[PDB]
Amino acid sequence: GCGELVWVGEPLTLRTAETITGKYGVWMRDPKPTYPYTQETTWRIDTVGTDVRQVFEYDLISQFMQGYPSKVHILPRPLESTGAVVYSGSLYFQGAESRTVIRYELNTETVKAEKEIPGAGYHGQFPYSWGGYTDIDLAVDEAGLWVIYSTDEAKGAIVLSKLNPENLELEQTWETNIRKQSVANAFIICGTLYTVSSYTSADATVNFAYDTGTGISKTLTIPFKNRYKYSSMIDYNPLEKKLFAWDNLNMVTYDIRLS
Ligand SMILES: [Ca+2]
Ligand code: NA
């Protein structure tokens, strides 16, 4: 079940990009897989450049780890940065040079919804500390779909909103006290937002928490290792109960333990 994060394991490298295009990126699985996909289906996006549109899809974990894609989707619009997620059959991603989140149904290659995140900074206003236009970070946890961002009104502090996954309407919004550009990335577990302290250090920590259920903010000191010294993407998968990350060409995963 659910609980507070109390431990992160060592990063395990599952695949390594072979070109500069994959220096940063996002890779993910669907915590609520829908036909024709399964819990093994993996998606990979190498996100260096200004016209990122190729989504690599693998039917099997074995193919993701050793082979070519089983299918490539070409997005109808270029994608921004590393914050995207897959949820219940759709890729949720941010349009380049925009504050728009797009719901792209993977099995039909159809855009089903688009939504400006109200007031969200974009394109280098409130990125995480490494930059990379990481202003807007989607997240899936045990309760469904979220987006992590900030606004002028929040003065750059992390804001997070629960999202309706069908039409992308904002359902509830919380404002933390954590300056988004002062942390390396963030993710949500069991309704609690966690941040990572550094994207370069082998001795980083999960250093802040904000619990949306209680409104309480905490400091933490849970060790977190950036094995390759440049983590551009850190998300949580609530089906696997693992962190998925992209660290300097390497697609890695971390075990976790909850209280
Ligand atoms: Ca994240
Ligand atoms: Na994300």
Author numbering: 244 to 502
Quote the study's own text.
Inherited missense mutations in the myocilin (MYOC) gene, within its olfactomedin (OLF) domain, constitute the strongest genetic link to primary open-angle glaucoma via a toxic gain of function, and thus MYOC is an attractive precision-medicine target. Myocilin has no known function, and there is no glaucoma phenotype in Myoc knockout mice or in individuals with a homozygous N-terminal truncation mutation or hemizygous deletion of MYOC, but rare non-synonymous coding mutations lead to toxic intracellular sequestration of misfolded myocilin. Among the common features associated with pathogenic myocilin misfolding, we demonstrate that a single metric, OLF thermal stability, can robustly segregate benign from early-onset disease variants.
At the outset of our study, five variants could be confidently predicted as benign polymorphisms: T293K, T353I, K398R, A445V and K500R. These mutations are all found on the protein surface and well documented in the literature. Three of these variants harbor conservative substitutions (Lys to Arg, Ala to Val). Structural integrity was further confirmed by high-resolution crystal structures, which were solved for 11 OLF variants. No gross changes from WT OLF were detected for the structures of T293K, R296H, L303I, V329M, S331L, E352K, T353I, K398R, A445V, V449I or K500R, indicating that these mutations are accommodated within the native five-bladed β-propeller fold and do not perturb the dinuclear calcium-containing site.
